[PDB]
Ligand binder design. Structure first.
Ligand SMILES: [Cl-]
Ligand SMILES: [Cl-]
Lengths: 9, 235, 235, 9
């Protein structure tokens, strides 16, 4: 189950 | 922090650190930018989020590896290895909690109270729920329940605002619902609430896609796919 | 460093850190293990090398990104961005040089002088050449030449020992020749020396493969492929 | 031109 990745702007 | 560096230079170096994939540096630069005391732009909020998401993401990944090894070491038929696995998992865990506390401290002093627009206030409250959720992932003591309620409260306030002030396709509204659904499934032992939230969020976004430009359509449908991916895994 | 932790616990936690991909922790643990003053086993030397190779590898990658941005900023038709790119590249560069100096300090105090066997002595001297090579990659001042000669001297001593004391298929002998050839090509502006060393190393290893077990054969042919890859790129 | 990777023990 994945949250928002949000590692790249 | 970084008190002698110009705010603009901190932002510029945060962007450079992201390009160099130096996320600890990026987080330190953005922490310094926040502590200049000025509100953050849309772009600057994204830089803050990306930096700490990467830092805590590495710590969570490491903590899961070590917690898995630790649990194997505490099984029937185990050969005592000493306190080392527990000690090192505790080290990583303490460092992770420090990062979460630092982010929560920035939100509390004073990002959230000065955020009046829906886009900024929902963004920060979503972050608050996220970093309490990360604390909940490792909590086992007399405050695991209080941490979980702190995450739920932040997410809930953010949801209430986003439903009143944002269209159903707004990427921040969609990402908030996605993460709140993950909270329900993984943290709160409420998989039915998780599935219901993801479905309702997806369906109401779909009905609003006709209003969007080609670029906004791509922004929203990307996050809708993430909701669909989770629903596929949960059902 | 890490003076209150048992040597065995440091080694155990270094292995845990590698599994968690926490290479800064891994390097700190192995630095503490080295400073216990005992010689290192074959396995422990590998842990030391892997940890610092990963740490400095991240710094070199970041330095190349920032140096590339800096060079673009200093071009005809450039819009001044301020001192930020140079300042941040200098920060990363200084941190990289600190790591290299730390490794070189460990080799000098006192890993190399106590290494009497060919396998350990060549291993450490190869490391010494490598970390002087990393210093050379960023050097621009009145000691770039001296740093390059320091790398060459370490590599050369290691080569002399390996040719006398190891078979041509020994993985450390092969990896030493590979890195020394990279030194010739990338640092010393001697591409013909680089090509000649890689070819001679590959050919003499091939002629010795018949002596090897199935497992040693796989070890050696893997590094031989790396020599071949470089020759393909250089010719 | 690649040196020994040496990132995995
Ligand atoms: Cl520890
Ligand atoms: Cl800087």
């Amino acid at each position: 189950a994945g949250s928002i990745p949000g590692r790249r702007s | 922090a970084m008190g002698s560096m110009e705010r603009a230079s901190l932002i510029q170096k945060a962007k450079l650190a992201e390009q160099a994939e130096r996320y600890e540096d990026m987080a330190a630069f953005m922490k310094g930018a926040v502590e200049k005391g000025e509100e953050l732009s849309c772009e600057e909020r994204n830089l803050l989020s990306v930096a700490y998401k990467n830092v805590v993401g590495g710590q969570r990944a490491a903590w899961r590896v070590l917690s898995s090894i630790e649990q194997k070491s505490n099984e029937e038929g185990s050969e005592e290895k000493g306190p080392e696995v527990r000690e090192y998992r505790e080290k990583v865990e303490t460092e992770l909690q420090g990062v979460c506390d630092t982010v929560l401290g920035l939100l509390d002093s004073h990002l959230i109270k000065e955020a009046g627009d829906a886009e900024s206030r929902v963004f920060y409250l979503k972050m608050k729920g996220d970093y309490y959720r990360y604390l909940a992932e490792v909590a086992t003591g007399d405050d695991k329940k209080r941490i979980i309620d702190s995450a739920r409260s932040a997410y809930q306030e953010a949801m209430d605002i986003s439903k009143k002030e944002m269209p159903p396709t707004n990427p921040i509204r969609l990402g908030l619902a996605l993460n709140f659904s993950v909270f329900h499934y993984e943290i709160a032992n409420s998989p039915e609430e998780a599935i219901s939230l993801a479905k309702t969020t997806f369906d109401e976004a779909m009905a609003d896609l006709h209003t969007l430009s080609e670029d906004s359509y791509k922004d929203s449908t990307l996050i809708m796919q993430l909701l669909r991916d989770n629903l596929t895994l949960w059902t």
